[PDB]
From Swiss-Prot, chains A, D:
Expressed in most brain regions. Expressed in lungs, in alveolar epithelium. This is Gamma-aminobutyric acid receptor subunit alpha-3. It is found in: Postsynaptic cell membrane; Cell membrane. GABAARs subunits share a common topological structure: a peptide sequence made up of a long extracellular N-terminal, four transmembrane domains, intracellular or cytoplasmic domain located between the third and the fourth transmembrane domains. Alpha subunit of the heteropentameric ligand-gated chloride channel gated by gamma-aminobutyric acid (GABA), a major inhibitory neurotransmitter in the brain. GABA-gated chloride channels, also named GABA(A) receptors (GABAAR), consist of five subunits arranged around a central pore and contain GABA active binding site(s) located at the alpha and beta subunit interface(s). When activated by GABA, GABAARs selectively allow the flow of chloride anions across the cell membrane down their electrochemical gradient. Heteropentamer, formed by a combination of alpha (GABRA1-6), beta (GABRB1-3), gamma (GABRG1-3), delta (GABRD), epsilon (GABRE), rho (GABRR1-3), pi (GABRP) and theta (GABRQ) chains, each subunit exhibiting distinct physiological and pharmacological properties. Binds UBQLN1. Interacts with GPHN. The chain holds residues 396 to 404 of 493 of the full protein. Belongs to the ligand-gated ion channel (TC 1.A.9) family. Gamma-aminobutyric acid receptor (TC 1.A.9.5) subfamily. GABRA3 sub-subfamily.
Curated annotation (Swiss-Prot), chain B:
It comes from Rattus norvegicus. The keyword Amino-acid biosynthesis does not apply. Signal peptide: none annotated. Its EC number is 2.7.7.75, 2.10.1.1. This is Gephyrin. The gene is Gphn. It is found in: Postsynaptic cell membrane; Cell membrane; Cytoplasm, Cytosol; Cytoplasm, Cytoskeleton. The lineage of its organism: Eukaryota, Metazoa, Chordata, Craniata, Vertebrata. In the N-terminal section; belongs to the MoaB/Mog family. In the C-terminal section; belongs to the MoeA family.
Length: 9, 413, 406, 9
């Protein structure tokens, strides 16, 4: 996985 | 100086280069937070004797319903000596062992007292109103745990429930992965101890106190190396002390760049990255050093107090968890709603925040506090979350209050 | 015997009758998890000196843009002695203090180097505003300012904040000392080998481990025989040594009522597990001790502990909201509803591609027990049965009580 | 605030 924020509209 | 390392590549290299510590045998009482380095087998049955599930009478199932003479009572903690012959029953309470004769238990709710002793006020005869099935209302020998059964696997991250289980099966000494001993120091000519009064041009060292406290929260042993002058000599001596005394060395500050020089030329260590594309934490440096078949890891965190505690939870804590034997040392990530509007940075951004769950809402709210050094939210709750804000894109440049973001759990909720 | 107490009433009555402990002075390093019994005021400014925010040069704003001679460099940890005169500038780093002359800092990205050592001279390309890119005295913390309020539950960040302002000794609420004991003629110590008709005591170990997880001091009163004499003696020791007494497994209630003259608030609670849970208070010398009599069943013991004991302990240590955290989650398995409110230990796991976490039951012991390498961190809160809903299906949203670090 | 499970439609 990644510790970077995942945006949703 | 150093190439720009992506946020993901930096993290992965930390976990990949971080070693897993050796094992030791500890007492089960001290097993809190430990990882099993062995399988745990039960050497007994649970229960070791057939035990009643309900308060009532132990009956011979083949007798069926009818009137029976009560030969005695089975009391918990004492193995019964009497044998139930056909037409007889034995009074039992919950947890009491079943006598030699009976093969089933009828609850007292399903019986009626017929006659009592002429005196002594004891039950003498009871009518069993139901036809028991063989084995009914009895926990047979080894019903819960059988001898030779594996009750705990190697790699189990033990909590209170597991510790009680160890106590159950009688395994009081158990082999687990060692905990990392972590050495923490601060560098800078302006730093004075918190216990000290201020002097011109000086401030107090808060990075050290915070970092030690953060690591202690996870239950790890720490070593206070104190404040080191920003010069190669005292710095090298400090590192040499940390290495001989600890498995992990954490330093903060010191931007020349005397620290990076010492690790490379003097210690012959491997510096994996010296800059990471993130906010805060840009000058974060991570290095490994191999001495006598043992790998030590070193963290050079930014001098800024917020940058220090943020990068610590991002890089140090997952590493420490791998070191203690945790199979997935990766942090817990939960979806939450922003409490405030936020502007996005080209870098992935992180802020200390407080997670709060509202009963009429499925998702928790995250309230930023990582706006330190200007406006600091005086809350009665400590920050238990690390806001994970995405890097800016051509399309999305701003996030609005209420919108869902990722939050990294960094404490008890 | 005792009236049947509703689940809500039992909880509220525990919190209402549990006292908040006295105060003590501790060192800031040992302040983790403590609640402040005082406001904390800063006795200095932070920063105590004007400091640059950016690497560049500290300039006199009235000089404006132009060519200036560099009179020196301000080094962190040393208060500068040189004064910037008109037409002069001083090299600065971030942590470095601002010299006496300058009133603004221009970053190196907005300047060009003119002369070099055999830096000597620079050309300033921008018109600086007064105070630009400088954090003035007391920008972050002002003297006399309250940095931490009374009632603050301190974590690592707060510990550092205390270290910053130089408050190394601070008054906080005492932690509760908790004594735990087990009763029963079938109980042997874990360290002991089994004997006929006997089993090993796991309740004591689990309960103590649970209380230790929250950082509270404990006292092991060991296993007590099921008779009033040994029982009374153990309780008197618990009262004299601890603020809280927990026992697990008719003799007990008699001793509390007749011998100790204590007040038993309830003896049965409409719940599963935990029906025979008993809670009592005892006032001795203006000090209130509280007593928890938990069920003998190991699962019943640990469940009731998290529901009643842990919130009580948190109120006692000064936490303003001792109520537990409850989060919404999805069942991993189908479950049937009981007329009683039901509780099960479970494991919460968050999936990156899913908004809500999943709850996987483990409270189905003594038949099929899920051997996971993760410890249970949640308490599933199952509702009492209704005319319409008799069963809950996989995926449906229920309440889960967080009972540990995730 | 109640420590009893809350049903969802």
């Amino acid at each position: 996985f990644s510790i970077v924020g995942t945006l949703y509209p | 100086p150093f190439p720009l390392t992506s946020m993901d590549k930096a993290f992965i290299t930390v976990l990949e280069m971080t070693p897993v510590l050796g094992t030791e045998i500890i007492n089960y009482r001290d097993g809190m937070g430990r990882v099993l380095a062995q399988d745990v087998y039960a050497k007994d049955n649970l229960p070791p004797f057939p035990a009643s599930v309900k308060d009532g009478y132990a009956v011979r199932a083949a007798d069926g319903p009818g009137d029976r003479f009560i030969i005695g009572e089975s009391q918990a903690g004492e193995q019964p000596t009497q044998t139930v012959m056909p037409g007889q029953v034995m009074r039992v309470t919950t947890g009491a062992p079943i006598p030699c004769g009976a093969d089933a238990v009828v609850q007292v709710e399903d019986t009626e007292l017929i006659r009592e002793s002429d005196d002594g006020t004891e039950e003498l005869e009871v009518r069993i109103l139901v036809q028991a099935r063989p084995g009914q209302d009895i926990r047979p020998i080894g019903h819960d745990i059988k001898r030779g059964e594996c009750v705990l696997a190697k790699g189990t991250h033990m909590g209170p429930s597991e510790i009680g289980l160890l106590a159950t099966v009688g395994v009081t000494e158990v082999e687990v992965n060692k905990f990392p001993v972590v050495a923490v120091m601060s560098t800078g000519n302006e730093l004075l101890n918190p216990e000290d009064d201020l002097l011109p041009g000086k401030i107090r060292d808060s990075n050290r106190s915070t970092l030690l406290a953060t690591i202690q929260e996870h239950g790890y042993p720490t070593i206070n190396l104190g404040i080191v002058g920003d010069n190669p000599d005292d710095l090298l001596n400090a590192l040499n002390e940390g290495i001989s005394r600890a498995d992990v060395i954490i330093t903060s500050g010191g931007v020349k760049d005397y620290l990076k020089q010492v690790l490379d030329i003097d210690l012959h260590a491997q510096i994996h990255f010296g800059r990471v594309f993130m906010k805060p934490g840009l000058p974060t440096t991570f290095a490994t050093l191999d001495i006598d078949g043992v790998r030590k890891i070193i963290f050079a965190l930014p001098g800024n107090p917020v940058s220090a505690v943020v990068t610590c939870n991002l890089f140090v804590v997952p590493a420490l968890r791998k070191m203690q034997g945790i199979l997935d040392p990766r942090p817990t990530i939960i979806k939450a709603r922003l409490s405030c509007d936020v502007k996005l940075d080209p870098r992935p951004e992180y802020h200390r925040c407080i997670l709060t769950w509202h009963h009429q809402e499925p998702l928790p709210w995250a309230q930023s506090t990582g706006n330190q050094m200007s406006s600091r939210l005086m809350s009665m709750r400590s920050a238990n979350g690390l806001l994970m804000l995405p890097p800016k894109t051509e399309q999305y440049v701003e996030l609005h209050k209420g919108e869902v973001v990722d939050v990294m759990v960094i404490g008890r909720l």
